[PDB]
Amino acid sequence: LTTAEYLAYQTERHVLTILTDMSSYADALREVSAAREEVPGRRGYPGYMYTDLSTIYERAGRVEGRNGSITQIPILTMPNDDITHPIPDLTGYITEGQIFVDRQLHNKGIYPPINVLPSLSRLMKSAIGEGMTRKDHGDVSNQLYAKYAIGKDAAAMKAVVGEEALSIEDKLSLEFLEKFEKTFITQGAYEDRTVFESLDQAWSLLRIYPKEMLNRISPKILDEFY
Amino acid sequence: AKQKMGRVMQTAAFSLAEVSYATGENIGYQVQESVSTARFKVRARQENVSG
Amino acid sequence: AEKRTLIAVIADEDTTTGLLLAGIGQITPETQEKNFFVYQEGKTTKEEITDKFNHFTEERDDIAILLINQHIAENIRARVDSFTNAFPAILEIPSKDHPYDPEKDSVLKRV
Numbered sequence: 001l002t003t004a005e006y007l008a009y010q011t012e013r014h015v016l017t018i019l020t021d022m023s024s025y026a027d028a029l030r031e032v033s034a035a036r037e038e039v040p041g042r043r044g045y046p047g048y049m050y051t052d053l054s055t056i057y058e059r060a061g062r063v064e065g066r067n068g069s070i071t072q073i074p075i076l077t078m079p080n081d082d083i084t085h086p087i088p089d090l091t092g093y094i095t096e097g098q099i100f101v102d103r104q105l106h107n108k109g110i111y112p113p114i115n116v117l118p119s120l121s122r123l124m125k126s127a128i129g130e131g132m133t134r135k136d137h138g139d140v141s142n143q144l145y146a147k148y149a150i151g152k153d154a155a156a157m158k159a160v161v162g163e164e165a166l167s168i169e170d171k172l173s174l175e176f177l178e179k180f181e182k183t184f185i186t187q188g189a190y191e192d193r194t195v196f197e198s199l200d201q202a203w204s205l206l207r208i209y210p211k212e213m214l215n216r217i218s219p220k221i222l223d224e225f226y
Numbered sequence: 227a228k229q230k231m232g233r234v235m236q237t238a239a240f241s242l243a244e245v246s247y248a249t250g251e252n253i254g255y256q257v258q259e260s261v262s263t264a265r266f267k268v269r270a271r272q273e274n275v276s277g
Numbered sequence: 278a279e280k281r282t283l284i285a286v287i288a289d290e291d292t293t294t295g296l297l298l299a300g301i302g303q304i305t306p307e308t309q310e311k312n313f314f315v316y317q318e319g320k321t322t323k324e325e326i327t328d329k330f331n332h333f334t335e336e337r338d339d340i341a342i343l344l345i346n347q348h349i350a351e352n353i354r355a356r357v358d359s360f361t362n363a364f365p366a367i368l369e370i371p372s373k374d375h376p377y378d379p380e381k382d383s384v385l386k387r388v
Contacts (some may be wrong), residue, residue, distance in 0.1 A: 161276050252290075254291075254293060258315065262303065263309060268284060
């Protein structure tokens with residue numbers, strides 16, 4: 001973060017720090033705290049883990065006079081696959097979004113095994129705009145999220161009420177879910193997909209729906225891009 | 227189907243009465259006598275509606 | 278079940294004759310039992326009609342659909358209500374000169 005601060009603020013370039021194993025960093029904090037006579041906190045980690053993680057995370061951000069930015073991808077390692085753990089809890093408190101890697105997706109050979117239902121970026125509306133990206137980005141993402149949730153619901157519903165009894169909006173949603181997980185989320189480790197190419201793939205996935213079904217997309221964008 | 231049953235049973239009763247009047251006697255006794263075997267049978271089918 | 282392959286008729290004389298002409302009911306020679314038994318209000322009694330209906334529903338396993346006259350079912354209303362089991366099915370077909378009563382139907386009463 002000192003290197004990032006230097007480059008971004010005294011050089012006017014964008015950084016995107018990618019920290020790795022902040023769980024390992026918290027373990028190091030535990031070791032350092034117990035080197036002194038500090039009594040362990042909630043889960044053995046020090047009571048000032050909130051302060052330490054806050055410093056490390058909020059070292060980033062844009063500034064006024066300088067034309068440079070620092071972005072952070074802390075990349076935690078949830079110990080028991082739970083969010084109630086102090087490291088994920090505090091990281092969610094300080095940070096400004098979540099990207100979830102799912103064991104269910106990983107066990108199906110889907111790379112990257114990111115599930116978009118628990119994952120969100122609170123600052124997405126600013127990044128995905130018209131001058132930035134392409135003007136359909138936000139509506140396309142919202143439609144993809146809604147239809148992916150409907151796909152999960154229909155996948156659970158099929159084994160309960162049979163495939164035939166599902167509505168058209170459930171059968172087409174199952175097809176969308178299959179194509180979405182196996183072609184959109186499933187990305188080659190060395191495949192570079194620009195935002196425009198990814199949005200084109202997203203539109204290709206959405207096009208299986210007739211224009212009347214895509215309701216979260218604005219009418220103008222729907223009429224222009226479909 | 228209840229309405230259809232009502233109309234169908236009405237017309238079947240009318241047809242049976244007409245047949246009995248044409249024959250001049252009640253064919254119920256003859257039908258009961260010729261009841262050795264049933265030409266109509268129903269086989270259960272496990273239709274899977276919803277779950 | 279697949280074993281139950283018959284259409285029991287316990288309706289009036291005219292309805293029983295019509296069912297026999299259709300061929301739904303018959304008398305088994307070996308079993309000495311009739312799938313379609315003709316019974317009216319004057320013939321036999323209410324207790325006999327109820328016993329015959331109970332035998333058709335339970336003792337006669339081959340019976341799948343039971344056709345009972347509405348006039349006959351009026352005196353066997355308690356038996357019809359007690360026959361809560363779906364199999365064999367019960368149809369509230371009415372007899373001659375008696376319109377069908379939706380209120381008197383046991384199946385429709387559950388609605």
